[PDB]
Each structure stands twice: as structure tokens, then as C-alpha cells.
Amino acid sequence: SLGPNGLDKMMVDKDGDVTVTNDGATILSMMDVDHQIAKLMVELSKSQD
Amino acid sequence: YGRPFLIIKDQDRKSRLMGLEALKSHIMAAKAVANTMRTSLGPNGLDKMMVDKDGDVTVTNDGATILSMMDVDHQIAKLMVELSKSQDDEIGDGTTGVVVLAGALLEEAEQLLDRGIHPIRIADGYEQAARVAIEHLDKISDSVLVDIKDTEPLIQTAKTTLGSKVVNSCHRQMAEIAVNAVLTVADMERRDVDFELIKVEGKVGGRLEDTKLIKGVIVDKDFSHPQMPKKVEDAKIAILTCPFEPPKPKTKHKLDVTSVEDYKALQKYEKEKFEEMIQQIKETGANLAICQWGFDDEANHLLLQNNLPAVRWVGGPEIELIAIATGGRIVPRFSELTAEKLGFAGLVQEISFGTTKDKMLVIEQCKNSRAVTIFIRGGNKMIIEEAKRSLHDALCVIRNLIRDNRVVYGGGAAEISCALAVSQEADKCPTLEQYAMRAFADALEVIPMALSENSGMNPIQTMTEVRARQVKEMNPALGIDCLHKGTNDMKQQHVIETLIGKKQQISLATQMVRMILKIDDIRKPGE
Amino acid sequence: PRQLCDNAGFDATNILNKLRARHAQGGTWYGVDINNEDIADNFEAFVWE
Amino acid sequence: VNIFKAGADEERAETARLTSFIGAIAIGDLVKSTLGPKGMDKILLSSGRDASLMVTNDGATILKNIGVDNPAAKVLVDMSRVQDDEVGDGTTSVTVLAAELLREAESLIAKKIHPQTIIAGWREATKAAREALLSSAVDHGSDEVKFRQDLMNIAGTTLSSKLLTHHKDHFTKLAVEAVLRLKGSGNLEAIHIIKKLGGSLADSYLDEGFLLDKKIGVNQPKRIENAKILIANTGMDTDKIKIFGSRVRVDSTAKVAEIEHAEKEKMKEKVERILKHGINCFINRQLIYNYPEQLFGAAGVMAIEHADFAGVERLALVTGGEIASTFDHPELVKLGSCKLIEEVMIGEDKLIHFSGVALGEACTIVLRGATQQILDEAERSLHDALCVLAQTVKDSRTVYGGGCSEMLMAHAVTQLANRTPGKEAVAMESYAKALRMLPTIIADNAGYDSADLVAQLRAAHSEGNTTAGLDMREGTIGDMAILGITESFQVKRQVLLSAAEAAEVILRVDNIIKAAPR
Amino acid sequence: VNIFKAGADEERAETARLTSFIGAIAIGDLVKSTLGPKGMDKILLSSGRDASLMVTNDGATILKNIGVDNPAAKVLVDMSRVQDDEVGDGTTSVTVLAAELLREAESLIAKKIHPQTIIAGWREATKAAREALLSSAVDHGSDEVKFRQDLMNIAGTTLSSKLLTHHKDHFTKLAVEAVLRLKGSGNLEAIHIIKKLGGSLADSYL
Amino acid sequence: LSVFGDRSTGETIRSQNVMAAASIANIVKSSLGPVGLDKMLVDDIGDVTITNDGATILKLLEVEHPAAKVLCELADLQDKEVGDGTTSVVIIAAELLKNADELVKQKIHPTSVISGYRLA
Amino acid sequence: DGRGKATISNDGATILKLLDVVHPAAKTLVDIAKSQDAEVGDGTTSVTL
Amino acid sequence: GAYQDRDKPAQIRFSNISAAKAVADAIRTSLGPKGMDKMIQDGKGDVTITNDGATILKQMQVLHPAARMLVELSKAQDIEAGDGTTSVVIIAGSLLDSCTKLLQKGIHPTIISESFQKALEKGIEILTDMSRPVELSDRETLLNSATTSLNSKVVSQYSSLLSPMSVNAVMKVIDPATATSVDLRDIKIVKKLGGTIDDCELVEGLVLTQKVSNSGITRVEKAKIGLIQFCLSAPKTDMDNQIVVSDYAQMDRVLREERAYILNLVKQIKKTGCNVLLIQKSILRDALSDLALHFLNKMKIMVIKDIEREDIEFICKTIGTKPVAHIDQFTADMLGSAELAEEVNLNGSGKLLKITGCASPGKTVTIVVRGSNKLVIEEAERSIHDALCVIRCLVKKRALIAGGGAPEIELALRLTEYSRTLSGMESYCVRAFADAMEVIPSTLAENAGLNPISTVTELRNRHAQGEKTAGINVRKGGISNILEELVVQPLLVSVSALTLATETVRSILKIDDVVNTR
């Protein structure tokens, strides 16, 4: 997802909604992680953004 | 009074359909079979691929196989399957369209039932129409009885019947193969031929064009001892069924050696008997031997010691093919073996046909042989099996031609003229059987329609033009330009077919569907 | 005869009535003819059991 | 190591692309059958709704009712929904073109060029195509003759894909007259679309005036001539109260009795204020109590109650009245005037006929036909036609369709492909082929030889015959201007732009990530 | 109306083609990685056999050990088995070429030309191609020098797709000497292949 | 082709309707005439109800088959109009239906039978 | 049958043999079918009627 | 030539056709003078008998969509004609059958639809040609049309009396001059259990299913009728109110004064001279109070509660009495008068209201339906409604056609010769079309127990010079001049049938595939 040549992600909401985006904060926010440090990185990106 | 009672056990689950509803259901099922089959007709047709219960696969066009491998449950589907099986093992291809005739006929029959005609009269009319059709057909028959030694009317016929199978790649060659084989094994004085004399054999590998008839017999064993020479020029052949072992009378038997000298005598006899049989086979003047059963290794060597190559563990049918091909006999002892019974051939040579697999044995016998084999090669096991079935059907059709030496140009012109004759009679029909007549004609009209459909042309423009031509002219030699050649004269196109083929096809279909109409009530037990 | 005519799809009442009337006096072997859809001397028609 | 909760996936850059593209192509080939003047149409059936089903040709509805799980497919569905919001048809076109774009982009991925370069090249080609299209537009301003001619041409074109095709001329006259009645107003709500069974589809028509599906009051006069019309929102049966909710506390039931009386006189004097305008026709969206209508009959004034905001708007537009309240200053409220009001019955129900209207601002089409499905799809088709035709009125430029315009686009793109040199040129040719694929599919569903037709058409266009297009009643090339097979510039422009954006967003994806559904 | 027993299918002319072609293309792209002098190779693992596994580059073995349900794929697998029975490598080539044939034929079906015409045209083109190939052959008879040279060339070529590539010259000498020992006998069983652990692969020898 | 239930036609349903009518007839066939013997109903819970008047029996007897419901309603109407003959009218209806079917069971066109009945 | 083997028949006695009757009284009729089949032939149908 | 790649469309078409044909054959039994009705048991537990097709199909919970379109077709035909619903659906079935034939007959469906359009044009021309113009004033032809429609349902039992019933009712409700499409809802239908269908009666007046509320008054002579809406109870304001009690005389002042208020109400009511009271529902608030009932019974006034709001317009139309919603407006001017009004006693104790004879003859009219079975009563009312519908249809077009399939065989013959004249595959199409029309006479013969094919063929042969007057006769069991057997149906019936069926079959041909939804 990094760089102008980069490629973005598309997320599937719990309720079946979709979202295409490149903003890493959103990428991790919409993610449903379970391993804790994944959550820590998600919160990392949210804070940085 | 009002209360349930048991009449037939499992009374809840013994279902029943009766009368016109049942009939319409049956016609629906038959039409489903017809639709499944339609695409397999014609050189432009497309074949099916089956999945075996055990997970095996098979690609084929032969409708008999199509229905055989099918796992149907509705009964009349089974009846059509058995139909195709019967038609095939009576004739050959045509099953390419027999059930098609059945389905179209039953469809139009339902068209009549919708107008409330009782089925029995429909059956009677259809029988009359069939009789008319066959008599007009064999009036308009050509014949190959007046033909010179029948080299390539037979070749043309094979060319035709192979226009439907994928083996069509070099189908010229396989046509010569089929005709040569059957002509060799035919009993003209009898008008029959037993296909047991024909040895169908396909070994995967190589090209398809490599497939070659062998005026001889091919045996799935190598030499008994690996050191023996691979080629033999002379073919003095011995055919034996007694294994090269000390004889044992199969009544429950065993000796009672007691003494020193007893055992020594037995030990001497052990090798003495091998020497005896070796001397016997040598003095017979034979050069090569074949045994039904296994060898004792010791005799295997001693046989090697005298320049007499041999084959071990040969199955029966193969053995008798050897015998008839070489003109030899089957000898049960060494002692009764003599030179006269010895088999002879031109050339016998093992072939390492497979690049990395075990070998094969071929006998290029050179005199006349009432038996012959076909060796099929190609790139696919499935293509091998398809070639087997196709060539078998070709042999069947040439056999049928031997049974009756009069044929009809194919391409649909035949039944076209049949339908026109039926229509002509329909005017002198009188009552209700008239609808039966025109009904059967229109139903029979299907085969040209299916051919054209698989040809991608507009079917009906083509068939109307065909009718117009075959009416304005008198030639019943105008079908459908299946292979897109500007002449509808299939006689020039050589697209031909045995009278027996179509005749048996239409009569059989008539009887089958007559019964199909004959039924009204069904009681299926719930599974 | 009634079942015969029913499987023949006729008005077996007309057939039956004509049958009884003709068969009171006119001849022993009159009976149902399927194709002519009415009475006939089936004996001469060779329906022999 | 497991990262997500159970029931969550992670498809990266192979399976993600594969699933997305399978979904896109499935959506495309799911709807390809509906496009083309000889196109087909679909049946959609509810899961369980007493089998609520809609025979349909407009692709937008088809994608609306289908439930899709593959996210890319859902993106495409929303795309079509938006495009329908803009022009009505071409939803068909938009989806199919996007689908072929994606399929051919997958073919490029097989050629293994980086997707970013694909995106850049496609952006360039889209820019070139839109420019060439703009160069191909044709205006029609004050030329009322040619204008109206081209207008009915647009109607005939877009209509000839739904079931109404075999009555193209009739509904063409319908839509033309209807939109011309709008006097340039883009508010389609001014056009009511009433549908009721019975009669042939040919029997559907536009009245000279207006129609209302309401019941008259008690025996006020049924028919009225030189009718004066007044419209308001002041509720009657909801007896006018003072919303805060004061009580009434009284010592004796004498007082409650006189209070009832005063209620009645208050209502009556409101009625008298109504009548002081000297108006014989009165309506309101609110339900009206029967005592007021009794007063009205005493005045002999016909009154129609409970015609919703839509009906009120349509009456105001058709009759010019100013929907009102309190009636306090009659001189300051402009009434409504119509030549005649009468009750007509159609099929089974008596309807309120409004002939001889002062203002042609509004109108309403009668839909006679065969099936609630047939009527429903006819309704949808006419709505799409009115949409596109109003858009035509707003922007008086046209484009020659029949694939011709799109093939001009492809030709220009191919020409620019040579000045590209680079990997982008491959995507340029890609875009051109995908574009050309549309009329190919058209003639395909038309059962003609697509391959030769498309090649001949491209030959003509590369020669320069910018007018030559496709004939759908004989399957050959021809002069579109002769046949008038045209469409609004804005339609195709939105088609291209939205499709390009869809391709961009879809290809930019290289990982799908589903959270566990709740 | 139901015709077959339960658990039986009927896919006609759209889904049949679709499934067959998906299987064929899946088989193809499953093995494309193994072909080429810079090609890759696969890992195949038993379901349960104490994890009997075979790192493999020869496509024929790969198709042999894979269990496939789509009938067309199984046809292709048998095809590769036969071809390996004939020449050893190119199983890779045969399968991949067939796969691309089928994919591109699917593209033609999208163009909607009748398959029978496709078959006829392909037959014609195959005939032409085989003829042209025959025109391009080069013999080497008594020219023992050029012969043996080309022989070791063949060894180096075909070998340079398996892991032994980085020792092409060595095993080239091996195979050349081995087959030259056969005195023209095609019985490969005359060549025993004993395998036992230890030492570098370079230490393998005749 | 209707979900959630099959259909029956022709002879089967005709015989079924006659069968139900005969059942209903035999339910009350023993309670008419100066030697009629009354019925009684163990309800489900012991609150029995002895009665010979047919309409009462039919009302207190649950019925599911359609034609039987038709006959029950006829009995109720008759009671609302006469008071007895529920002793009789049900029997009359069932017997007429039986013989009319027996005619139809052969072939006889139903509407002809209906016209004959009207005349009768 | 329950075994899946089809069997068509026009002779009524054969059919009744296939229709394994449980109700007792009808077993007598089916036995009459066997009797007539062993005695004289078609009309076993007629016998039952 | 061109190649057809896909086969899913053809297969789905075939499935739809088979479903339609099966539904047609299921309906096929119930048809014509020899018609046999069906019964449907609801999953709810309801039971219905029916011979009319539309009710049958509405009771059908059809799964396959095609037949749902067929059901909708039947609904439209009924809301147009009333019978021939059977006929139109059976035509639909036969058409789709010939459509199958044409599908394996390889012709593309669109050409089929266009040829069908030509066919229906020829058919409509022929049908218009063959009819007999008939003035509305001739009672006996009306009666013949009635008894033609009637002797196909169960009510043929008392056809002889039911036909004059319907015709007289319609004549009394129409305007015999304007030849408009006089509404059926002006005819009141009453399902009253018990009695005999023979005892069905016309009431040239008004009938209310409600029961009296006065104990003592049953019959009133020279009664003057008045209908009142405002409640008769303690005055309760629209907005919240309450009496406050704080003092001494408040108690008796209240009680005495609501008594006085009710007294004033009733006293004015009498002063108008009325003797029969009508009160509508006021579920929102107090209805007629008991005390007012006491006064009215004391003053000997006929009284009725619970008049449905939907009935008020019908009642005021019939007895000619505008309602009154406030005390003051209630005046002897508006009190309607009727010759007689009272409560009949049927059902043993099921009591009913009749008001026979009115000096102000309302154009409306009512029907009383009698009979034993509930189901037979419902079927009878259905059939009578169908009779009124067919009479209205005859009013719509003063044209008459002899029934008995003769129009249809005429159509078959003329269309067959037309197809012979007209070349192209459309000729094959039209020949199929005529063979499709051939079905109705076949069904008539089948349900008549006659040899169908022989009869149809002989009837065509006769009709070659035996024009539409001749046809299939039931009573003689053969072929005769049906017109002299007096069995005739209006042109509109079969015309609408053909038109609707043709449009539906064209629409069906447009269909190719069905997509399951969410």
C-alpha cells in the first residue's frame, strides 16, 4: 500500500459492506484482528493518522 | 364404512400415476433423453463424456455406450437404454440416432394425445406407417450385390460410418483396415462372420495413424526366457497345453518312495523326462513353441539350449488365434506332437513398442489366415477405447452388409423420401389413422432437422429446399450437405448406409414407441 | 362389454342398449366391434374363444 | 500464525484478483443478454414474498435485486445503481463494458505487466476517448424542427430495448408529448405514472389533461364545468386544535355542550372563509371530516380529500393554483382554474378526470396492458425514457449511437496508441478492443455475424465514415443520420467516465479481507 | 423431471465447457512453474503415509500423484503419463501447451464460432505444423564426431531443468557414457540406478 | 404444480368423496326411526353427551374432509329449519350421492345427472 | 419391485402376482387369477372383473 | 453459418413452456357448457369450490413464475370480461405449446412474436367482421347472452331464474342511452346463508346485513328515512375535555343536563318527522348512547347502529338521502322517504333488513343470494357477478358472437388460409397459431364426451360453407347452428382473450433466464 506505485486494499465489513482504500489507518481499523500486537499496530496507525 | 385399511404393504409410499398424466410424464422423460442424445448425431455432431461410478472417465459418441454407462432411475429411461443396446449389438451405429427417432416420435404422439386420440389407434397407425416406410425404402434401395469384388463400396461405407467418430483423423486408413479385416475373415459361403476371429487390441502410445492391422495374432507376453533371440525368420510353431513339467494325473495322487534306489530312480526320472520332452520337440522339427501354462525353469533353460524360443502363460483365446493363424493344431502331449500339426508363419518378432515398458509379441504370418488382429495406437487411453468401439462398429456394419448386399445413400435423403411417401399415402389414408400417418411423417422428419442443427445452418430452410428438390426430381439421393459441399447428391458424396441399418432402426423404434404408448399406469415404490 | 367400450372410449350406454334390443331377437353372436364402434356378429367376424 | 478471528479471510494478490474478476465477469455475462435492440430480458423472483417477481430488462433493477457476496460485484452493482440514477439505461452498457474491461485486464495480468502501468495507460486512453467523443457531438438549439425530430429519435432508440419495442412509435409520441409538456422543468414528479390492468398495451395513452385516483365526497356534484380550484393542507377531520394540548375543565355539562357547538361553528366559519373565494373545487392531502363536506354540499362545492403531497404538487402544476392555508386573504392567493372536471371509470374504478387545464406543466400517462409484470416493466421503461429525455432537454446535444460513437472512441484510442510507445500502448490497444466489444455483443444478441460486422465497421470508421453505424433490423452497416439511431452525449459520457473509475478502483485492489459476518 | 439417481449431475454445453476449461487451465498453470531452464519445481506430500513426499520437477510425476476430480483434468493427466512413457520430459511442455490451447479455444468460444469448425481448423494447422517441423529436422548418421557432440548437447539441454542443472557437464558425461555403453540396445534395465545417501551430488558417478 | 400438497383427479377423488359421504352416513345410520338407537360421545375428558339428533352429533363431531363438512353444514341448516330429519336428511343426501356416483362411476356425464336430479 | 427390476404386463394374473396383496379377501381374488392362468389364459383379467 | 454457443436460454424457455402447458391442461377440465368445477383447500384450513378460472388461479399458490404470469393474465381478463378466463388461459397454453414446436422448429422467438402480431391483427379483423351488431334495448338477446355465460358454472341449476335476475338488475342500473361502462360496484351482493338458491331474490331497494337495535319496532310503513353521522351520547370534544366537580348542585345539574341534551337531540329528530334512524360507525369515540336509544324507542323510531363508512355512499345513492352531520342541518328537506322498510326473518333467526320502494329511485340495486351450502353460495355470487360483467361487456360493444367455439374455428380456418397466402417463416408461425386456436373446440368435445378429432374435423368441413352460425352443440351432442340454439357471447370477451394472450406470449418469448434473488 506504500508509494504512488503502491496498491490499495479492499475491506469487507461485518455487516457485508465494502470499502476500497489506501489509508493504512482505515486498513487496520476495519481489520478484525485477534492476536494482541496486531491490535497494538492498529492503534498505532490510528494514532499516527 | 369410512376407515383406512391396508391393501398393499408400504401403502403410504407406493405411489401411482395413471392415465393421461402418466403418459405426458413419460413423454417428458423420453424427450429429455432425446435432447440429451440429439447433439451426438451427425459428423458435425458432438459426443459425450461419462464418469464411471468408480471415478473412471470415458469419452464416446456411440449412443449405446452413452446410455449403458448412464445411471438412470426413471423406468422408461432404462427402456431406452436397453433399446440402444439392442439396436447396437444387432447392427452398429445408428444408435447415433435411434433413440432420437424414438423421442421425436413420442413428442409428436403427445401432440396427438393432446387432441384426445386414444393411444391404441395411434399405435396401429404408426405400425402401418412403419410398414409403408420400409417398403418404400427397400424399393428405392441401391444394391451392392451387382458390384464387382466389393473393395471400395465397402471402403465408401466404412468412410461414411466413421464420419461420426473422433478417429476420423486418418479414417481413410482405418476404413481400409476394417474392410481388409472383414474380407479376410468373412465366410462368403455362409454370409456371416464371427468377430471372435477379429482380435481388437489397442496399446497406448504413438500416433493415431500408427494404428495398423496385422495379418496375424498379437500376444501380451514376451519370451519365456529373456536371453532368447528377439527375431525369428522361420516360424515352425508348436502349440502346447501341457505345462513343461513332470506329468501329474489330477486325480488325488502321490508316490511312496521308500528306498535309496527308489529315490535315486525318481531323481534320475526328474531330468530324464525333461530330456525326453526336449528330444520330442526337437525331433518334431519345430522351431518355436507356445505353452498355455507356466514352465519349470529347468526345462526353460534346456529349451534355450536348443535354439527353440517359446512363450509362457498364454491365455486360451490368444492361443487358438495363434493356431488358426498358423494353421497348426493344439497338441496335449509332447508324444502326440508331430510335424504335421506344427504351425507355420512368415515372421515372428517381439516388439519393444513401449519406450520404457515391457514388450509385446507379433506374428506376421504370411499365408492365408482365417483370423486377424488390429493394433491400435495413440496418445490417450480414452482415445484408444474410443477407437476400439468405433472400429468395432465399423466391422459390425460391414458384416451387416455381408448379410445383405443392398444399401441406401445416407445423409437423410432416405427417410426424407420415406416421409414423402408416407404423406402421399396419407391422402388415401381414410379416417383417423390419417392423423397418425401425417404425424409419423412429421416425427420422422426430425433426423434431417437434427443433422442441419448440428451443421449450424438454419435447419428448416435447408430441409424445405431438400423436400422441394426431391419432389421436383425423382432422385431419392438428396440429403443435407453436412460437410458443406455444394452438392446434395450424397450418391456422389458417397454418404451411404445399409438398408438393414435404417430398416431395423425404424422398425425397432416403431415397436418400442408402440409399447410406450401401450402403457398407462405406473406404481413406483418409494425408495 | 362396458369395460371394453370404456377402454374404447364409446358411449357404452348406446352400445349396451342397442345390444340388448338387437340381442333380444335378432341373433345370438352380436357383440361389440371395436373398429366399427358398434354391434356386429363377431362370430362371423371371427372373434372366437 | 492465526491473526484474525475465526471466520475471517486473507486473499493476497492472486486469489483476491481471481475472485474479484470471476465476480465481475459473472456479473457482466449475467446481464449481457438484456442489451441490444434485439436484446433479451430477465426474470427475478423473491426468495419468499408470495413470489414477488419482476420480469425485467433494465439492468439496474436486475443488479439491485440480486444479492451478491463478492465485494467487487457489489461495487459494480452500486455503480450501475448510480448510473441509473443519472440516465436510466446504459446500466446495461456500463456493467457490460466494465466487465469486459476487467476480463481483458486479467488477460493483461497474464501478460504480467504491473497494474499501476495499466491504470496509467487506461487513464490516458479514457481522456483521449472522452475528448474524441466531445469532438463528435451535435447540438440542436433553436432548430425546433430538427430538435423535436431528434427528440423522438432518442425516444425510439432508448425504448427499443424493453418489451415496448413493438410499439415504439406510440410510446415515442407519448414520451415526446409528456416531456414537452414539462416546459423545461426537470421534475419528473410532474409526470404521474398510473398503472392498472386491462386492455392492450397499445391502449395505454396520455390524457389531454390530468387524472386522480381518489374518491369523491358524499353527493357533491359529480361533474363540474368552468371549475374553480383551491388547494390546501389544512386538516379537517383532524379537527383543528392548538397543538400544545390545553385541557377543557368546566363546571357543568352545559359548558361542554356549548363548547361542542362552538367547535362546529368554528369549523363552519372556516368553511365559509373557504367559500368566500367562490371556488367550486377544493382538495387537500389531509383527510376531511364528513361534516365539512356536508357544508360543502350545502354550498354544492365538490371536494376531493386525501391526495398526497405528490398529488397536491401535480394539481398545483397542472392547474396553477397555490396550495394554501387559513384562506385569510383571498386576493393574495391565486386559485386554480380548469375547463372541466368529471368522473371517468377505467377498467374497474372511477377516476377523477381533469380536462382543459390552464397549465400544461404536469401530466399523467394511462398504462393499459397485460401483466403487473408487463405493466411494471413498462412503467420502469417509461421512467427511464423520461429521465434520459429530460436530460436531453437540459443539454441539447446528441451522439450517434449504434456502437458507432464507441467505435470512433476506439479508433481514436488506437491512433493514440501509436504515439504512446511503451508498455502503456498495450493497455491502449486493450482499451480499444474492450470498447469495440460492445457492438459485437449487440450484433451477437442480434444473431448476426459479429466478427465480420465489427471488422467492417472499424474499417469504415478508420476510413473516416463517422456516421456509419449498425442496422438492427437487417444486420449491416449504414448511415445513422438516416436512421436517427442517436442518444444523449451525457449518457455515454457518464458511461465512459464511470467505467474508467470502476476499472481503476477494481484493479487497484490486490487483497480482499472479510471480517467474520455477525 | 428427475431422471438419474441421487448424486448424479447433468451439465450441458455451458457449465460442462466451463468446468472442463477451468480444470484444464488450473492444471496448466499448476505446472507452468516447472518448465524452463530457469524453471522451478514442486513439493508433493502424501495425505498420510508418514508424510511420503517428493520434491519434483518432472511434470508427469506431479500429475501422477495429484488427485483430480474434474474429468478433463484427469484426461490431461493420463495424457502426460503417456507422453512420459514416450520421452520423459516435455510432459511439462505437453500439459502447458494443451492448457493454453484450451484457454485460447475458450476465448474463441466467446467469439462464438462453432466448435466443429475449430476442430477442423486445428487439425489442418497441426498437419501443417508437423510438416514444417519435419522439414526442419537435422540428421547425424556416420558422423560420429558431430553425432556424439549433439548427443551431449541433448543431455545438457534436457538435464537443465531438474536440480542437477548446476552439474550439467558432469551428468552429461554420465548419461553419454551410459547410453553409449548400450551398443544400441534400448533396454534401459541394462542401466541400474543405485541410490544411497552421503557425499555431494558431484560425487555421484559411473 | 403446486408446492405444499398434491392433487387428485377424476375417479380417485370421486370415489373418495363417495367414501366420505358413506362414512358420514354410517355414523348416524343407526339413530333414525321409532327404533332408532341414540349416540353418545366421550368427548375427550369425560364430559359425555348422549344424543340421537343427528345435527347435534355432526356439530360435536370434528370433521376434516371437505364433502363431509358440507354434509355437516347441511344437517345444521336442516336443524335450523325443521328440527328432525337430521334423523333422515343426511342419509338421503349420502344415498343420492352414492347412486349418482354409481351412474357416473360408469361414464355418465355429471351435468346430465344434475339435470335429472333437478327434474326429480 | 423394491429391487428396482422393471416388469410390464398385460396379463392380469401376472400383475396381481406383482401386486403383493396384504388385505386377506383380495388374496382370494389373486389366487383365482393364478387358477385361471394355470387353466385357460386371458380373461384372468375378465375373471377378476 | 452463425453458431449458437449457449443453451441455457433455450432450456429455460422450454421449462417455462412446459409449466404453462401443464397449468393450461390442469385448467382444461373446467370449461364450457359441460364445465366441471374444482375445489381448493387452503393451507389456512379454508375450503372453496370454483369453476371460474380466475378464482382457481388466485387460490393457486403457484411456484413456477410463468404460471404466475398466467394467473395475472386471468385476473386481468376477469377484471375485463368475467368468463373466457378459462378460454384465455387455455389459449395461452396452446400458444405456448405451438411455441415449443416452433422452438425445436429452430426459428428465433422474435420473428415468432412479430408473426404473432400479424396473426392477431388478422384475427381481430376477422372477429370484428363476423359479429352481429345488437342494440342494448333488446331484452331477449341480453337474456340469451346471460344464459350463455351462466350455463357453465354450478348455477346452471337455476339458470332459468338467475338470468332474468341479472339482466333486470343491470337494466335498472344502467343509463340505457349513454352506452357507458356502468360500474358493477353499484350492484350490491349479499351472502346470506341458508335457504335455497331458487329463493334468490332481487330487492329494488336497500338491504343492510346489520340488525335492529330497538326492542319493539320491527315493521314501519310510510317510513321516512334519515341518515345521521354525529354521535348521540354525552358531548365529547375533539380535543381533551373534562367536567370538574367541586360544588353541591354540580351532581344533579350534570345528570339532568346530559339528559336534557339528549332530549333536545331526540326531540329535534322527531320534529323533523323522521321515524327510521341510521347511524354510522364512530369507533374513534362514543357511539349512540343507550339513553338516546331509550328516548327513541319511547318515541317509536326505527334505529340502526354500525353503518360502515364504505356503505354510506351506496346507501345515499340508493335511498336518495344525503347524510346529516350536525343537528341544525337535519331538516325535513333532507329526510328521505321509502314506501316500506322493515326487518325480514329468515335463517330461522338470522334476521335481515329490507327497504323496498323508494320515491327517489336510485340507480343502484342489490341482490340477495340464498342456498344451503356456504361454498355453493359463494360460487353462485361469483357466477352472478360474472353475468353482470358479461352484460357490461356487451354494453361496451354492441356486438354479438355466437359462442360454442365457432368463432375460434372460424379464426383457425381464416388464419390457415392467410398463412398459406403469406410466405416466409411467418407462414409457419401463423399455421401454428391457427392450430393453437383449434384447441377450444377440442376441449368442448372432450368435456362433451364426443370423439374430439372427428367432431373438430367435421366441424371445420361444415364451416367451410357453414359460417359462424354453425358450431358445436352440447344438447344434441353434435354439430348444428348454435345461434338458433341461442348460445351467444359478446365480441369483447374473445377479443380481449386473444389480445391479452398474444401480448403475454410475446412477453414470455422475450424471456430467457431466471435469476434467484436475496
UniProtKB/Swiss-Prot annotation, chain B:
Swiss-Prot/TrEMBL catalytic activity: ATP + H2O = ADP + phosphate + H(+)
Keyword set, alphabetical order: Acetylation, ATP-binding, Chaperone, Cytoplasm, Cytoskeleton, Disease variant, Hydrolase, Isopeptide bond, Neuropathy, Nucleotide-binding, Phosphoprotein, Ubl conjugation
One GO location term (cellular component): cytosol
Assembly, per entry: Component of the chaperonin-containing T-complex (TRiC), a hexadecamer composed of two identical back-to-back stacked rings enclosing a protein folding chamber. Each ring is made up of eight different subunits: TCP1/CCT1, CCT2, CCT3, CCT4, CCT5, CCT6A/CCT6, CCT7, CCT8. Interacts with PACRG. Interacts with DNAAF4. Interacts with DLEC1. Interacts with SPMAP2.
Modified residues (Phosphoserine): 15, 335
Role description: Component of the chaperonin-containing T-complex (TRiC), a molecular chaperone complex that assists the folding of actin, tubulin and other proteins upon ATP hydrolysis. The TRiC complex mediates the folding of WRAP53/TCAB1, thereby regulating telomere maintenance. As part of the TRiC complex may play a role in the assembly of BBSome, a complex involved in ciliogenesis regulating transports vesicles to the cilia.
Associated pathology: Neuropathy, hereditary sensory, with spastic paraplegia, autosomal recessive: A disease characterized by spastic paraplegia and progressive distal sensory neuropathy leading to mutilating ulcerations of the upper and lower limbs.
Gene: CCT5
Domain of life (superkingdom): Eukaryota
Annotated residues for binding of Mg(2+): 93
UniProt entry tagged with the keyword Calcium: no
PANTHER family per record: CHAPERONIN
UniProtKB/Swiss-Prot annotation, chain D:
Membership in a protein family: Belongs to the TCP-1 chaperonin family.
Classification via InterPro entries: Chap_CCT_beta (IPR012716), Chaperone_TCP-1 (IPR017998), Chaperonin_TCP-1_CS (IPR002194), Cpn60/GroEL/TCP-1 (IPR002423), GroEL-like_apical_dom_sf (IPR027409), GROEL-like_equatorial_sf (IPR027413), TCP-1-like_intermed_sf (IPR027410), TCP-1_chaperonin (IPR053374)
Molecular functions per Gene Ontology: ATP binding; ATP hydrolysis activity; ATP-dependent protein folding chaperone; protein folding chaperone; ubiquitin protein ligase binding; unfolded protein binding
Residues with PTM Phosphothreonine: 253
Name this polypeptide is given: T-complex protein 1 subunit beta
Documented EC number(s): 3.6.1.-
Record NCBIfam families: chap_CCT_beta, thermosome_beta
Location of cross-link Glycyl lysine isopeptide (Lys-Gly) (interchain with G-Cter in SUMO2): 240
Claim: Nucleotide-binding is one of the keywords in the record: yes
Assembly, per entry: Component of the chaperonin-containing T-complex (TRiC), a hexadecamer composed of two identical back-to-back stacked rings enclosing a protein folding chamber. Each ring is made up of eight different subunits: TCP1/CCT1, CCT2, CCT3, CCT4, CCT5, CCT6A/CCT6, CCT7, CCT8. Interacts with PACRG. Interacts with FLCN. Interacts with DLEC1. Interacts with SVEP1.
Catalytic activity: ATP + H2O = ADP + phosphate + H(+)
GO terms under cellular component: azurophil granule lumen; cell body; chaperonin-containing T-complex; cytosol; extracellular exosome; extracellular region; microtubule; zona pellucida receptor complex
Sequence positions that bind ADP: 36, 90-93, 160-161, 402, 487, 492
Compartments reported by the entry: Cytoplasm
Coiled coil regions, renumbered to chain: none
A single BP term in Gene Ontology: positive regulation of telomere maintenance via telomerase
Curated annotation (Swiss-Prot), chain F:
Residues with Phosphoserine modification: 2
Localization per Swiss-Prot or TrEMBL: Cytoplasm, Cytosol; Cytoplasm, Cytoskeleton, Microtubule organizing center, Centrosome
Record: residues binding Mg(2+): 84
Record annotation: effect of changing residue 34 to L: In IDDPMGS; uncertain significance
Binding site for ATP: 33, 85-87
Residues the record lists as binding ADP: 33, 85-88
Function of the molecule: Component of the chaperonin-containing T-complex (TRiC), a molecular chaperone complex that assists the folding of actin, tubulin and other proteins upon ATP hydrolysis. The TRiC complex mediates the folding of WRAP53/TCAB1, thereby regulating telomere maintenance. As part of the TRiC complex may play a role in the assembly of BBSome, a complex involved in ciliogenesis regulating transports vesicles to the cilia.
Disease tied to this entry: Intellectual developmental disorder with polymicrogyria and seizures: An autosomal dominant neurologic disorder characterized by a broad phenotypic spectrum. Main clinical features are developmental delay of varying severity, intellectual disability, seizures, and polymicrogyria. Additional variable features are non-specific pyramidal or cerebellar signs, and visual impairment.
Assigned protein family: Belongs to the TCP-1 chaperonin family.
Name listed for the protein in its UniProt record: T-complex protein 1 subunit alpha
Residues of the full protein shown: 5 to 124 of 556
From Swiss-Prot, chain G:
Residues the record lists as binding ADP: 43-46
Organism of derivation: Homo sapiens (Human)
Portion of the full sequence shown: 51 to 99 of 543
Residue positions binding ATP: 43, 46
UniProt-recorded name of the protein: T-complex protein 1 subunit eta
Organism classification: Eukaryota, Metazoa, Chordata, Craniata, Vertebrata
Disulfide bonds: none
Known disease link: De novo genetic variants in nearly every subunit of the TRiC complex, including CCT7, have been found in individuals with a broad spectrum of brain malformations, and clinical phenotypes ranging from mild to severe epilepsy, developmental delay, intellectual disability, ataxia, and other features of cerebral malfunction.
Subunit structure: Component of the chaperonin-containing T-complex (TRiC), a hexadecamer composed of two identical back-to-back stacked rings enclosing a protein folding chamber. Each ring is made up of eight different subunits: TCP1/CCT1, CCT2, CCT3, CCT4, CCT5, CCT6A/CCT6, CCT7, CCT8. Interacts with PACRG. Interacts with DLEC1.
Entry's family note: Belongs to the TCP-1 chaperonin family.
Gene: CCT7
Job description of the protein: Component of the chaperonin-containing T-complex (TRiC), a molecular chaperone complex that assists the folding of actin, tubulin and other proteins upon ATP hydrolysis. The TRiC complex mediates the folding of WRAP53/TCAB1, thereby regulating telomere maintenance.
